[PDB]
Amino acid sequence: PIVQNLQGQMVHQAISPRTLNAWVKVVEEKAFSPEVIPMFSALSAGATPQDLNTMLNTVGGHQAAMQMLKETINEEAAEWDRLHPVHAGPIAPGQMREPRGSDIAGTTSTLQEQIGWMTHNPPIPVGEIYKRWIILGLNKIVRMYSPTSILDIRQGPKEPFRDYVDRFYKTLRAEQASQEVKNWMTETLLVQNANPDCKTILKALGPGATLEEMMTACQGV
Amino acid sequence: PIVQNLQGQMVHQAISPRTLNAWVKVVEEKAFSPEVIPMFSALSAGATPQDLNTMLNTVGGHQAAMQMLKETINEEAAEWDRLHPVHAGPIAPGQMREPRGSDIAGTTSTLQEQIGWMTHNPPIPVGEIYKRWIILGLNKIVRMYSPTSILDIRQGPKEPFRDYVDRFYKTLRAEQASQEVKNWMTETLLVQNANPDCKTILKALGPGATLEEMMTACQGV
Amino acid sequence: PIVQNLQGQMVHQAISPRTLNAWVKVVEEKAFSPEVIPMFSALSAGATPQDLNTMLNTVGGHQAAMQMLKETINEEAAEWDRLHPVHAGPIAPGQMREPRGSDIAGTTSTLQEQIGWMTHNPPIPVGEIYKRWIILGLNKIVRMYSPTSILDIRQGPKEPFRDYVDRFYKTLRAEQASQEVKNWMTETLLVQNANPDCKTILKALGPGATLEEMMTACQGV
Amino acid sequence: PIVQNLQGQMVHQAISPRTLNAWVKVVEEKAFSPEVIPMFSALSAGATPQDLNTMLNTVGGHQAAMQMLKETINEEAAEWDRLHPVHAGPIAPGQMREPRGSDIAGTTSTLQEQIGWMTHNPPIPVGEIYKRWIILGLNKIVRMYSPTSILDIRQGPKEPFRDYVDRFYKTLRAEQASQEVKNWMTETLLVQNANPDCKTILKALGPGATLEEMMTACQGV
Amino acid sequence: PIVQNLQGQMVHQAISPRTLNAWVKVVEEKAFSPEVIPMFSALSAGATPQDLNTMLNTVGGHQAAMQMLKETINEEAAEWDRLHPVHAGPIAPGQMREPRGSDIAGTTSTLQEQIGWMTHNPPIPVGEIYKRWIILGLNKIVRMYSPTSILDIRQGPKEPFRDYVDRFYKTLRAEQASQEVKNWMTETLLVQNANPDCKTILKALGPGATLEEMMTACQGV
Amino acid sequence: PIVQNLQGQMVHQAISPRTLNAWVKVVEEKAFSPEVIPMFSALSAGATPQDLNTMLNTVGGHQAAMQMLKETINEEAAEWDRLHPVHAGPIAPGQMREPRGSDIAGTTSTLQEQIGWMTHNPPIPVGEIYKRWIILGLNKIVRMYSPTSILDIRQGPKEPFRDYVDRFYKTLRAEQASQEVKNWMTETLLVQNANPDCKTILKALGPGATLEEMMTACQGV
Ligand SMILES: [Cl-]
Ligand SMILES: [Cl-]
Ligand SMILES: [Cl-]
Ligand SMILES: [Cl-]
Ligand SMILES: [Cl-]
Ligand SMILES: [Cl-]
Ligand SMILES: [Cl-]
Ligand SMILES: [Cl-]
Ligand SMILES: [Cl-]
Ligand SMILES: [Cl-]
Ligand SMILES: [Cl-]
Ligand SMILES: [Cl-]
Ligand SMILES: [Cl-]
Ligand SMILES: [Cl-]
Ligand SMILES: [Cl-]
Ligand SMILES: [Cl-]
Ligand SMILES: [Cl-]
Ligand SMILES: [Cl-]
Ligand SMILES: [Cl-]
Ligand SMILES: [Cl-]
Ligand SMILES: [Cl-]
Ligand SMILES: [Cl-]
Ligand SMILES: [Cl-]
Ligand SMILES: [Cl-]
Ligand SMILES: [Cl-]
Ligand SMILES: [Cl-]
Ligand SMILES: [Cl-]
Ligand SMILES: [Cl-]
Ligand SMILES: [Cl-]
Ligand SMILES: [Cl-]
Ligand SMILES: [Cl-]
Ligand SMILES: [Cl-]
Ligand SMILES: [Cl-]
Ligand SMILES: [Cl-]
Ligand SMILES: [Cl-]
Ligand SMILES: [Cl-]
Ligand SMILES: [Cl-]
Ligand SMILES: [Cl-]
Ligand SMILES: [Cl-]
Ligand SMILES: [Cl-]
Ligand SMILES: [Cl-]
Ligand SMILES: [Cl-]
Ligand SMILES: [Cl-]
Ligand SMILES: [Cl-]
Ligand SMILES: [Cl-]
Ligand SMILES: [Cl-]
Ligand SMILES: [Cl-]
Ligand SMILES: [Cl-]
Ligand SMILES: [Cl-]
Ligand SMILES: [Cl-]
Ligand SMILES: [Cl-]
Ligand SMILES: [Cl-]
Ligand SMILES: [Cl-]
Ligand SMILES: [Cl-]
Ligand SMILES: [Cl-]
Ligand SMILES: [Cl-]
Ligand SMILES: [Cl-]
Ligand SMILES: [Cl-]
Ligand SMILES: [Cl-]
Ligand SMILES: [Cl-]
Ligand SMILES: [Cl-]
Ligand SMILES: [Cl-]
Ligand SMILES: [Cl-]
Ligand SMILES: [Cl-]
Ligand SMILES: [Cl-]
Ligand SMILES: [Cl-]
Ligand SMILES: [Cl-]
Ligand SMILES: [Cl-]
Ligand SMILES: [Cl-]
Ligand SMILES: [Cl-]
Ligand SMILES: [Cl-]
Ligand SMILES: [Cl-]
């Protein structure tokens, strides 16, 4: 993170050991469940590309996902260099240079250069752009490591409707279904995969029924 | 949360890992017991709509309640757009725009826009309004997931009166009974569902008896 | 709690998750032992009526004691309204209004109104008065939930005198005995309920003996 | 504790939940071992008489020692009132009054009065004086609860000399032996209670031998 | 670490017990796994050579690696003295002297001298240079303590392809393979060491296939 | 520790409960292993003689080492009084007096006197000098409590060379061997106490071999 110096400068704030161990423990415990991506977005608030690389390098194991994530960063950095070409002549002494793709990734850039980009006015949010690339690669890792398909999420003859709905939207979240995909799935597959007794209840509920109405109705079955 | 910059600005304060792990652990341990709603109100003091969405997205599992909560937010945001219509012409450069329903929800708004709304004078408390919508949806989830009805809360022939009163008001709290409903329930059902020996004691106590008098009297049975 | 803003205002300070979980854990572990009341007085130092209601609402279970505590707050708020009647005409725009009983309880008052009362000069300590009502109700709950009477605290024929004195004053504290009641109980019941050998030792010690002299003398028996 | 307000006042700083739970846990775990008295002196650095009473009242159990400690405070407060008599006429409006014995104890004094005494120039260190009374009573409790006499600390025929010296000075510390008492005990009883083989080694070491020389010599036996 | 004094000086900030115990616990738990080197780089952000020596000396055990690390520091300090020779005449009173190799190591230098070097303008980053020597020695220790060769990382006939890729890049990271070495290893050895069914799938995928394409294809085998 | 007051004074900063419990737990767990001495040097950064005495007095047990440590402090304080004699006439009102040996030890000096010595210009570092005496006594305690001699550290016929080197330098550290003693021991005893197969490998390696070369060579045996 970046914090303002008491004299006036903008200095880099080290990652607290609390944030470090919290990150390595939620990865050790929950692996690549969907909820660890917003947790990574929370523990990396205001971080620089060097801070982001620090959090990612402290991960033990999961090196297959780390190399996949590194390939996604390289692709996004290449697209950035295509969209933001540099007229790189001789360097200007003491002036802010335009960041390349690898500069946003924090590999070919220094902590001072990253601070100067993020604290500029207008700021070049190299930390937020890099963080957006990491979220993109993490979404691909979570989707790939999704165990079950939505076709195999069917309510058992004695499973409570709320528990089957739990597995339903848990699978939809792992498969990176957007909110509209979840809405259309609520109108169709959720009713069509409920057990016979609940399915007749959900059909008699009528179209346009909300999730509160569907779960309250099938509470008795 | 929002904190004042030492130079003068109003900057966003990141959620501490302590607050994050405290929230995900009380949800993992207590699920949707009534006491986790005031705990959510405590851990989200002064938070922005982006901070609130961060706390809600870090929840693992319970995706049925999350989609229900998302439906309640959509309904309240639609009622807000009906009560506060916008005369949305061309945008004013560098000026504060009127927040829509989805802007209060933190989806179609940015962290800077939320800060500007909350730090304005008079403030547009988008964080408190969004937080009020979340409390409303959480109350519906707790009420739906209430296991027992108040009819099945009856004092056993050897259960202490205080323990039966514990289950009594615990069930009333889960079923979202207001304070007047609990007062009228104390005058009627609490006596009518006590075991025979305690019931005769509570009847001889006379009307208008307080809970201290009722629990002290049936202490011997 | 209330903390001074760096610009000059008096702003509300959110309850730390450390204070929250410390409160819910000492209630989960020790229930209504006498020592949890001073702990509640320590964890609620400088709190507002809204902060106090937050700590009390985060308690899981014990709803019988919570409703008893709520009845005691209502009684004390009614006595306050009798002792401090309001000449409530039309409201004065932008001026501090006189707090009623429910305003001290934090139900009919807002966080801004509570801050203005507590930060006034002279301050209207609505937080300390409300906290004094809560301590009063908590004392009634601890006294009611006291298991043993002082008559059944008698030194066994092989129990060390210090352990019997432990149970003695532990029972006296639960039954809300004041310091003079404990002093007179030390002169009388403590000697009269010691086992025969210690009782003869305590009688030969002479009147006006201190607790250090009584426990050192019966150390051999 | 007392901390300086940013505007200029001297305000009371609440006891952190870390300090509270640390105190109640070292008392729960170690009871009245000698090392808990310096720990109490460390966790109560700069505390007011109200903070000290808060830490002492949060102790669960050990009510026999608490009443003994309360008797010692009363004795020291009575000796203070004898050494510092007050010419208590009518009170001076807005002026600092002379603290009595019970005012130092924090019972007949308020937090504001204690702050004014401690922050005066020259300060009336009511917190340090009260803390000195508490240390005096705690020393009497630790000495009374000392299990073994120094006569029964004798080196076994196969116990390492360092372990017997451990029990030796551990017993001397519990019995409140000063440093000179420990020095004279090192010259005499420590050698006279070592097992025969070590005792002959310690005698041949010569007089005026240090503890390093005594423990290094008997390392082989 | 170094922090600015409120008056104006640059003072040394002590290592927090959180950072200390976090370092000694990740060494106790994970030994010399690759991820503990970036963790050491994170917990030592902004540290002085004295702070670095403190963190390294608090390590219990692993004294073989500690002496190896000490030999690597001596070699790098000797190369520094060769690249930066000093014209060491008489000392200049009150002036900053040129740091030698052992001065960067923090052995022949004091905390004040290290602060003056790091807080100078331009700064002599003795902490970052020393930290770079430590990372170099730690890399040699991790590489030496690597258990398996990449030749013995072969996918079992029933091991999921992602798990074999996990062991593959985990071994490559332990053997200090750079990113290009990992890229060329992905093109060659990763396919040539997959089990027969996956190997035929990876060959039919075509050249230039990414890790996401390789792991998604062999998901069925 | 000492911290600067916001008004301008230099005030004593209380030891945090984190630092206290961290010290008493590393002593409870690791006793007098060599690594607890640098840990004590880290947890006592910037401490006063009163803070140092507080940390040492909170130690439960190990009273044999505590009395040995107290004898070493007395010897060093006597040598200080010999090297720095005082011309102690009448005291100068309001002036800084020269510290004696017991004043550095923190027994015959007050917290205010210690602060004035440490915050003077030039400072009288009574805390660092006392801390240097404590490190000296702790080194004697660790050396005395060293279990094994270096003669009994011999590589087993099936022990990995790195593990035997671990026990080798672990024993050398406990016996307070300096770095040159460890270097000469690496050239001689380390090879002469390796098992026959490794010993022939280390002899064929040639003289002047480094620890990295010795451990990499004997990796196969
Ligand atoms: Cl920087
Ligand atoms: Cl941590
Ligand atoms: Cl999120
Ligand atoms: Cl790395
Ligand atoms: Cl750009
Ligand atoms: Cl940009
Ligand atoms: Cl995706
Ligand atoms: Cl069933
Ligand atoms: Cl599932
Ligand atoms: Cl259907
Ligand atoms: Cl259901
Ligand atoms: Cl159900
Ligand atoms: Cl912002
Ligand atoms: Cl945390
Ligand atoms: Cl609440
Ligand atoms: Cl999400
Ligand atoms: Cl509006
Ligand atoms: Cl509004
Ligand atoms: Cl509801
Ligand atoms: Cl029974
Ligand atoms: Cl129930
Ligand atoms: Cl009835
Ligand atoms: Cl009862
Ligand atoms: Cl009962
Ligand atoms: Cl406010
Ligand atoms: Cl917490
Ligand atoms: Cl109290
Ligand atoms: Cl509530
Ligand atoms: Cl009033
Ligand atoms: Cl008032
Ligand atoms: Cl009472
Ligand atoms: Cl017995
Ligand atoms: Cl009892
Ligand atoms: Cl009698
Ligand atoms: Cl006894
Ligand atoms: Cl006894
Ligand atoms: Cl105050
Ligand atoms: Cl705590
Ligand atoms: Cl002490
Ligand atoms: Cl009390
Ligand atoms: Cl006085
Ligand atoms: Cl005085
Ligand atoms: Cl004593
Ligand atoms: Cl033996
Ligand atoms: Cl003992
Ligand atoms: Cl003798
Ligand atoms: Cl021994
Ligand atoms: Cl021994
Ligand atoms: Cl310094
Ligand atoms: Cl710690
Ligand atoms: Cl890194
Ligand atoms: Cl060391
Ligand atoms: Cl240089
Ligand atoms: Cl340089
Ligand atoms: Cl390497
Ligand atoms: Cl299988
Ligand atoms: Cl492996
Ligand atoms: Cl091939
Ligand atoms: Cl796979
Ligand atoms: Cl698979
Ligand atoms: Cl002071
Ligand atoms: Cl602690
Ligand atoms: Cl060190
Ligand atoms: Cl002591
Ligand atoms: Cl001097
Ligand atoms: Cl000096
Ligand atoms: Cl030594
Ligand atoms: Cl073997
Ligand atoms: Cl060993
Ligand atoms: Cl040889
Ligand atoms: Cl080896
Ligand atoms: Cl090996």
Residue numbers in the entry:
A (entry chain A), B (entry chain A), C (entry chain A), D (entry chain A), E (entry chain A), F (entry chain A): 1 to 221
Question: Paper's wording?
Answer:
While E45A also crystallizes in space group P6 as P38A and P38A/T216I, surprisingly, we obtained data from crystals with two different unit cell dimensions: a = b = 87.6 Å, c = 56.5 Å (resolution 2.5 Å, labeled E45Aa) and a = b = 92.5 Å, c = 57.8 Å (resolution 2.2 Å, labeled E45Ab). The ~5% difference in the unit cell dimensions between E45Aa and E45Ab is explained by the repositioning of the loop between helices α8 and α9 (~3 Å movement) in E45Aa. This important movement primarily affects interactions at the 2-fold interface between neighboring hexamers; specifically, between helix α9 from one hexamer (α9_hex1) and the same α9 helix from the neighboring hexamer (α9_hex2). As a result, the hexamers in E45Aa arrange more tightly than in WT CA or E45Ab, forming extended interactions at the 2-fold and 3-fold CACTD-CACTD inter-hexamer interfaces that are distant from the location of mutation. Interface area calculations reveal that E45Aa has ~160% (726.2 vs. 453.2 Å2) and ~510% (236.4 vs. 46.3 Å2) more buried surface than WT CA at the 2-fold and 3-fold, respectively. Notably, a novel inter-hexamer interface is formed in E45Aa between N-terminal domains along the 3-fold symmetry axis (IA 23.9 Å2) mediated by R82 of the E45Aa CANTDs and a H2O molecule (6 H2O per hexamer). Thus, the enhanced buried surface area and inter-subunit interactions observed in E45Aa may contribute to a “tighter” structure of E45Aa, further stabilized by CANTD-CANTD interactions at the 3-fold inter-hexamer interface, potentially contributing to the hyper-stabilization effect observed for HIV-1 E45A cores. Surprisingly, comparison of the E45Aa and E45Ab structures with resolved β-hairpins revealed that they assume two distinct conformations that differ by ~11 Å (as measured by the displacement of the Q7 Cα): ‘open’ in the E45Aa, and ‘closed’ in the E45Ab. In the E45Aa where β-hairpin assumes ‘open’ conformation, D51 maintains interaction with P1 and now adds a second salt-bridge interaction with H12 (in yellow). Most importantly, the unique interactions between the α9_hex1 and α9_hex2 helices from neighboring hexamers in the E45Aa structure, directly affect access to the common binding site of PF74, Nup153, and CPSF6.
